[PDB]
């Protein structure tokens, strides 16, 4: 600590006085995260063996909630033509918990691959299906040109190119009839500078990549302030209070000492906040408990030493904290 002041003052002679050098902080010893039991596992690999998928606006959904999803059967490694992923890989979803999961399957074009993205616009994004901002998964795609493609175009599948307005996330339109396309309603039957909203795939196996079918499977993810029902492959790492730990509670990740308080919360209020809009007190999603968030102790380091020509004795001072280690 005598040399800590030498590098702070950038000199080999330390004059008498008090000088600040570093900042001490208590690191978390363990990780306390608590969520209840797992319900079921999502069909990540069961939708890859389907014979034919739905269209862009027709996407079929199988509802299996409570991530962790199925990590066992994974076809996503080097088995397909193109891999475009966002967020984290599905192998890493075992460390995260999501509320609801909707497995969707649809076929798009070459120029429509770049339009796939959470919270982004596009022809199929706004007018057909939009990815929510809560989706951390990978977008799986493969080239179906050897199957779904037909001579002169395949009109079996359909898609909607135009709509009177953009669709919000998690919204569907199954209507195949003639409705308003642009901003000026033409009152039913096509004409008056409007366009027929429904469209058909023109897939020709002999043209470029933009005109060829690509089977895309996306599992819709949802993340809210609702309490999570699952934690990891392992759950509790049983709580021991009055210690510095790293906690994730109801989706709020932080580091601090967990203590019990007298705070009275409403049954439907999951967690509160302080005047700083930061985590203050939270409730146990698994069982009935009330925990208060106390961040771990930290402060500045003060060095009290006499002159270099006087003595080498050094007194270390911690500001506004109690030392339990020493």
């Amino acid at each position: 600590p005598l040399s800590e002041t030498k590098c702070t003052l950038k000199s080999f002679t330390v004059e008498k006085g008090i000088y600040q050098t570093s900042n001490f902080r208590v690191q978390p010893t363990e990780s306390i995260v608590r969520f209840p039991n797992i319900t079921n596992l999502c069909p990540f690999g069961e939708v890859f063996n389907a014979t034919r998928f739905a269209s862009v606006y027709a996407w079929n959904r199988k509802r299996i909630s409570n991530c962790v999803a199925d990590y066992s059967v994974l076809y996503n490694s080097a088995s397909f033509s193109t891999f475009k992923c966002y967020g984290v890989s599905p192998t890493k979803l075992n460390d995260l918990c999501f509320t609801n999961v909707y497995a969707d399957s649809f076929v798009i074009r070459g120029d429509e691959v770049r339009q796939i993205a959470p919270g982004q616009t596009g022809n199929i994004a706004d007018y057909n299906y939009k990815l929510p901002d809560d989706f951390t998964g990978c977008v799986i795609a493969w080239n179906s040109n050897n199957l779904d493609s037909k001579v002169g175009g395949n009109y079996n599948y359909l898609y909607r190119l135009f709509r009177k307005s953009n669709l919000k996330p998690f919204e569907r339109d199954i209507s195949t009839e003639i409705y308003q396309a642009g901003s000026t309603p033409c009152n039913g039957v096509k004409g008056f500078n409007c366009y027929f909203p429904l469209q058909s795939y023109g897939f020709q196996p002999t043209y470029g990549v933009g005109y060829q079918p690509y089977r895309v499977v996306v599992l819709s993810f949802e993340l809210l302030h609702a309490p999570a029902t699952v934690c990891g492959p392992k759950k509790s790492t049983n709580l021991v209070k009055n210690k510095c730990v790293n906690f994730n509670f109801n989706g709020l990740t932080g580091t601090g000492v967990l203590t019990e308080s007298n705070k009275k919360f409403l049954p439907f209020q999951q967690f509160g906040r302080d005047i700083a809009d930061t985590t203050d007190a939270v409730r146990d999603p698994q069982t009935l408990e009330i925990l208060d968030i106390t961040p771990c102790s930290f402060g500045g380091v003060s060095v009290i030493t006499p002159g270099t020509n006087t003595s080498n004795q050094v007194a270390v001072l911690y500001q506004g904290v109690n030392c339990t280690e020493v």
Binding site: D274, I275, A276, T278, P295, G299, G300, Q319, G320
Partner: peptide
Amino acid sequence: TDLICAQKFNGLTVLPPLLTDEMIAQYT
């Protein structure tokens, strides 16, 4: 004229004064 401890959690450190309140009235 707690607000002090609430602000100390985000990295705002209020240093105690060298001259306390008891010694001020003793100088006066």
